[PDB]
């Protein structure tokens, strides 16, 4: 076959992976991977062009990002602006793209039956784009809003500060429109020139995943990508920075320039060194810095020419000891030089990656195709699956080679802290970031180059947590499709399901510990939290090995008590669990740690002011709608009465009375489940003298019930971001089969029209979201928007949209209606693809205490019965502006600066303004809880 340079059929894969794979290279030079998965619900494709922002024209910063936007807005064969995205939406799909420095990546997914259709449309992007004239003037605004949202984010400012000291890759209105106009530059022509010059077939990689045979996929990709053109396009210090952040954060970033290690994939020297320097076990860098009271966290490793980084957060004491911190880093590195490369370590890493690969979790299709699409430019067809996991050559010379770059003489150090506020003299141009730059004194350098051996630093030791028993226990005779309650006592309820799907030797063990004293008042909530933070900080050293060994855990405070999840290989899981609970029940608090963690928590309470407007809106709606909720402010205030004595006294009391609800799910037997449950119970009894809680003490909170025909608005100002956010909530009623499918069908139907009208056409903002809101057994319809436009306008536009939608639902045909039905049906019936997603589903059924495990089938069966009439009258009853049962609440978050045709917006009534949340709550009824 003339069209194929070569076919590499065998492609090394995990033996758990039943998908099939075929690699080829087309005539025009494109590398392709094909993936057949006859089980899959969604198909997916991705395309990665090995060009990105580093290749922008010097006079038009941001051009390639802009191009990435422009490819989506129409082709010769499909000229409708959103034919592509509407198709996707109408076929259970979605799509996105990103631009990195050396890559541009476009990917989508879709219902498995319309792959070919999506793909045909997708193919057109690379053959003929319209670059519509009208699309351009709007979309430069889309790009501008993208940058606007990020402006006051700390990470982006650090990112760009490091790069500037150098192009600005993102672009904005200035760089993409204003400045080019001023300088006689035609931007459309430039786009055309860039597209023609750099979007060469030879720089492309495609991956496609679908239900189709490997042969059918082959023909699809041959057909649609053979015709791309191939025009042989060649592939293209000692400074200190003191930076003022937006949030109150304290960090130190240390970075060393290194060569591009990508080609060393068979050894991965940067990962070896990252592994070693980034360790959190006994003997480690972090362990010393933390003992010294200087740091809470450390990350080390390679960052994308390339860099090697080591970043840490800072306690109050640390901020004044940055120089010594760095001295220790250099001592540890010197330790690594002195001992030289270690074959045994490499062998462990190689083994752990091998095991991780054999039992890797099945990926979400979109991510898998996108990721592989990215990495096909770097690896032979046959190795693309394993290249990122499988180490093969031990190469101590490369490891040493990279170690030679981690020297005080090519170091860059950046400190981010509010303490530099006012003490700075430079301003970064694009984001406005205030900072000072200074030469590191040669004497400090000299001292570091002479970093001595301390002995407080040891290599880690053998990881004893490495699992070695992988037997999959056989499926029980009496197995059931949903979790079963296999133990029901005063102290504890145990739900259990043996895995009958995934067949990896893993499990998830979840426990809610209920106690009323965890949330009785702000002080107790603060204490519960500080307690759990202290416990995790103290377990960290021991737990880290386990985490490397595919055993992790999550421990956090909730409104009901405490939450514990242990996941991973079950070979060693009860050992970790036993250490956690035993330490939980016998915890002794170190004072220094208490002061440090308390201070960190104080700052995190403060940092809420710098969240996004829409995060604020969700937060306040949450406060408004829940019977009891403590604000971040109240917690902060209450935080000062937390002393060591008080916490020490609180802990035994918190544990003194409990109820435990658990879901144990994975590769474990009933006897082993009962065993684990009983181990927990007995440990708690032994060490904390726990007794059962009374049935009557199991309070769940209710949701405020809004009055018929009312509209309430709650308004607040964001002090940090110069955008606004709004959330609009139409509360409907309690959950039940029909109300749920009415709301869900409506959300499904209005889902894509809203994006296309409110964002793509009317450009109300970057963030435009809609959908069901479910809390506390109640539900309703919500809208979330973040915008430059004032809230009252957003309101009027959403209301006009809702009317457009009613008219549109009336006017639509039987078949289109059934298409919406069929699409909702597929969405609802989507099987979880990996263990922890199924666990999440069951846990959701359990924590709400609705226990409707077969809800998806009942509701979909019922869904198929519904007609236009039903939805029209639902809408008329619950949603329309003059609906007898309208219940509308709105949260307005004003921009810092903000003050306190188009289809036709209806006249709206005067809203009632909420002055004080507590009064609002006191003055309204509460819903029931949902019956189990």
């Amino acid at each position, epitope marked *: 076959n003339p069209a194929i340079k070569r076919i590499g059929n065998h492609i090394t894969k995990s033996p758990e992976d039943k998908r099939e794979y075929r690699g080829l290279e087309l005539a025009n030079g494109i590398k392709v991977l094909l993936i057949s998965d006859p089980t899959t619900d969604k198909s997916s494709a991705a395309l990665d062009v090995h060009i990105g922002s580093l290749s922008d024209p010097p006079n038009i910063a941001g051009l390639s990002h802009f191009l990435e936007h422009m490819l989506f807005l129409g082709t010769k064969k499909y000229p409708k602006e959103n034919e592509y995205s509407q198709f996707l939406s109408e076929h259970a799909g979605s799509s996105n793209a990103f631009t990195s420095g050396e890559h541009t990546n476009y990917y989508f997914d879709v219902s498995h039956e319309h792959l070919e259709g999506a793909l045909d449309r997708f193919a057109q992007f690379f053959l003929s784009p319209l670059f519509d004239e009208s699309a351009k003037d709007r979309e430069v605004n889309a790009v501008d809003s993208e940058h606007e949202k990020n402006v006051m984010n700390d990470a982006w400012r650090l990112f760009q500060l490091e790069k500037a000291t150098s192009k600005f890759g993102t672009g904005n209105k200035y760089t993409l429109e204003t400045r080019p106009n001023q300088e006689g530059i035609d931007v459309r022509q430039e786009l055309l020139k860039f597209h023609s010059a750099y979007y060469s077939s030879n720089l492309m990689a495609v991956v496609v995943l679908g239900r189709e045979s490997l042969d059918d996929l082959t023909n699809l990709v041959v057909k649609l990508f053979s015709e791309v053109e191939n025009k042989n396009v060649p592939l293209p210090l000692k400074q200190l920075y003191k930076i003022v952040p937006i949030k109150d954060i304290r960090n130190l970033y240390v970075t060393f320039p290194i060569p591009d290690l990508q080609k060393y994939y068979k050894s991965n020297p940067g990962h070896y060194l990252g592994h070693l320097i980034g360790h959190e076990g006994p003997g480690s860098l972090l362990s010393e810095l933390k003992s010294k009271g200087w740091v809470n966290t450390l990350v080390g490793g390679q960052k994308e020419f390339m860099f090697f980084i080591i970043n840490v957060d800072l306690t109050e004491e640390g901020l004044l000891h940055v120089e010594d911190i760095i001295l220790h880093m250099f001592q540890y590195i010197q330790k690594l030089r002195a001992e*030289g490369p270690q074959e045994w370590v490499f062998q462990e890493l190689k083994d752990l990656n091998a095991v991780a690969f054999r039992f890797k979790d099945k990926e979400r299709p979109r991510g898998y195709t996108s990721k592989i699409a990215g990495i096909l430019h770097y690896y032979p067809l046959e190795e693309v699956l394993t290249a990122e996991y499988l180490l093969e*050559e031990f190469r*101590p*010379d490369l490891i*040493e*080679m990279v170690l030679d770059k981690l020297r005080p003489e090519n170091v860059r150090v950046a400190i981010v802290s509010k303490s530099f506020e006012g003490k700075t003299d430079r301003t970064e141009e694009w984001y406005g970031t205030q900072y000072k730059q200074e030469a590191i004194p040669d004497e400090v350098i000299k001292k570091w180059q002479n970093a001595d051996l301390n002995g407080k630093f040891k290599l880690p030791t053998k990881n004893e947590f490495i699992p070695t028993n992988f037997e999959i226990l056989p499926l029980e005779k009496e197995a059931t499709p949903y979790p079963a309650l296999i133990k029901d006592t005063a102290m504890s309820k145990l739900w259990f399901k043996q895995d009958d799907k995934f067949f990896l030797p893993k499990a998830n063990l979840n426990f809610e510990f209920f106690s009323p004293f965890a949330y009785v008042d702000p002080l107790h909530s603060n204490m519960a939290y500080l307690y759990l933070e202290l416990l995790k900080d103290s377990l960290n050293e021991y737990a880290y090995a386990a985490e490397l060994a595919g055993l992790s855990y999550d421990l956090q405070n909730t409104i009901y008590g405490m939450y514990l999840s242990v996941k991973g290989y079950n070979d060693k899981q009860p050992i970790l669990l036993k250490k956690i609970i035993e330490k939980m029940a016998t915890f002794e608090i170190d004072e220094k740690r208490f002061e440090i963690i308390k201070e960190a928590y104080m700052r995190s309470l403060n940092n809420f002011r710098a969240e996004q407007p829409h995060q604020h809106a969700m937060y306040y709606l949450r406060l408004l709608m829940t019977e009891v909720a403590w604000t971040k402010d109240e917690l902060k205030e209450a935080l000062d009465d937390v002393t060591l004595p008080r916490l020490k006294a609180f802990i035994p009391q918190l544990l003194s009375r409990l109820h435990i609800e658990a879901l144990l799910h994975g590769n474990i037997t009933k006897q082993a489940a009962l065993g684990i449950m009983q181990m927990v119970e007995d440990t708690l009894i032994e060490h904390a003298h726990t007794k059962p809680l009374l049935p009557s003490q199991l309070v769940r909170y209710r949701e405020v019930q809004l009055p018929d025909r009312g509209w309430f608005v709650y308004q607040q100002r964001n002090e940090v971001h110069n955008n606004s956010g709004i959330e609009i909530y139409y509360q409907t009623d309690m959950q039940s089969t029909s109300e749920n499918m009415f709301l869900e069908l409506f959300a499904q139907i209005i889902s894509e029209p809203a994006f296309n009208t409110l964002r793509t056409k009317e450009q109300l903002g970057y963030i435009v979201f809609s959908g069901p809101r479910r809390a506390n057994g109640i539900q309703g319809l919500r809208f979330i928007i973040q915008s430059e436009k004032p809230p009252h306008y957003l309101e009027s536009r959403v209301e006009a949209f809702l009317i457009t939608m009613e008219k549109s639902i009336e006017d639509m045909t039987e078949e289109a209606f059934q298409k919406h039905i069929q699409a909702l049906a597929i969405r609802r019936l989507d099987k979880p693809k990996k263990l922890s997603a199924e666990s999440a589903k069951y846990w959701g059924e359990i924590i709400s205490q609705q226990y409707n495990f077969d809800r998806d089938n009942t509701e979909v069966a019922y869904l198929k019965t519904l007609t236009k009439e039903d939805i029209i009258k639902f809408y008329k009853e619950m949603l329309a502006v003059d609906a007898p049962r309208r219940h509308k609440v709105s949260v307005h978050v004003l921009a810092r600066e903000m003050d306190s045709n188009l289809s036709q917006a209806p006249a709206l009534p005067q809203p009632e303004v909420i002055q004080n949340m507590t009064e609002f709550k006191r003055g309204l009824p509460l819903f029931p809880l949902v019956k189990p």
Partner: antibody
Amino acid sequence: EVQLVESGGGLVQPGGSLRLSCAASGFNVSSYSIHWVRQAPGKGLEWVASISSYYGSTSYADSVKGRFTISADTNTAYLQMNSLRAEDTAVYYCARDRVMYYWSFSKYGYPYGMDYWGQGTLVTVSS
Amino acid sequence: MTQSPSSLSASVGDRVTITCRAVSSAVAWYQQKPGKAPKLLIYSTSSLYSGVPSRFSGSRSTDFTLTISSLQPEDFATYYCQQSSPSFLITFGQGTKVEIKR
């Protein structure tokens, strides 16, 4: 099919000059290391010089320091002999490193093999 | 640095062992037939090059040792133990001449 070729050997009046060429084929000299190893007549294997063209590094034997030069054009390597003593008469072989991107600068050396050698050229030096 | 011995002699089918004593704590092996260029036998002091007879093993007791268990009639050549050291330096031994024994 990887392979090497040596060329330039002949008969040179002592204190003369010669330029050998290790014509490479099947791989790029840029990301491999080219060694030059001369055997005497009836004596043992002796190493002369080497070059890592990626790290642009070179290395010569203490037998010849300011009388030899190893360089390479990226697809051949060239050993340049200057003022050749009567004892430099021998057979020179040139090999490459089995592993790519060997790091020249090192503290502990790692004996990787050399998988592909040339079949040498014999330079005879006598007046 | 050194090798042992000057040479070795033995029958076909016999067991020959060469010891090369040597920073760099490894060693590689080459088999040279009289006249031709050297041939690579073992690279990591343990593992052998690709497409080499399985009868060549690299061992270590300290000293390093190449071993020919089922010596054939075409494995009668000179054997070189090489080192690679700091400073980009290469170094071979004086050669082990394996001779056939009548």
